[PDB]
């Protein structure tokens, strides 16, 4: 994991994104979405990640 002033960016594309293996996973300390609701992410489609 890089540091805060040289953070690393990975672009995600060309795949189904299952946040179901992430949202029903109780292993993170903060999961804060802005502009979306973390329970409706499997009904949308996105251009990039």
């Amino acid at each position: 994991f890089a540091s805060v002033y040289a953070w690393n960016r990975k672009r995600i594309s060309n795949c189904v994104a299952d946040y179901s293996v992430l949202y029903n996973s109780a292993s993170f300390s903060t999961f804060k979405c802005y502009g979306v609701s973390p329970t409706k992410l499997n009904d949308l489609c996105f251009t990039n990640v």
């Binding site: 502009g35 979306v36 609701s37 329970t39 409706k40 009904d43 949308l44």
Partner: protein, 45 residues
């Protein structure tokens, strides 16, 4: 083979209906202008 006093009424009314139609695409300070894109990616609260 003149009628501008009648064409003025037609034009003013069409010009008002066009503005009413076109105001349906302003956000008024929301995230989207279309209601279904607020309903689809947001929850009731």
């Amino acid at each position: 083979s003149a009628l501008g006093k009648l064409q003025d009424v037609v034009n003013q009314n069409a010009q008002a209906l066009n503005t009413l139609v076109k105001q349906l695409s302003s956000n008024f300070g929301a995230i989207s202008s279309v209601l279904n894109d607020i309903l689809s990616r947001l929850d009731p609260p």
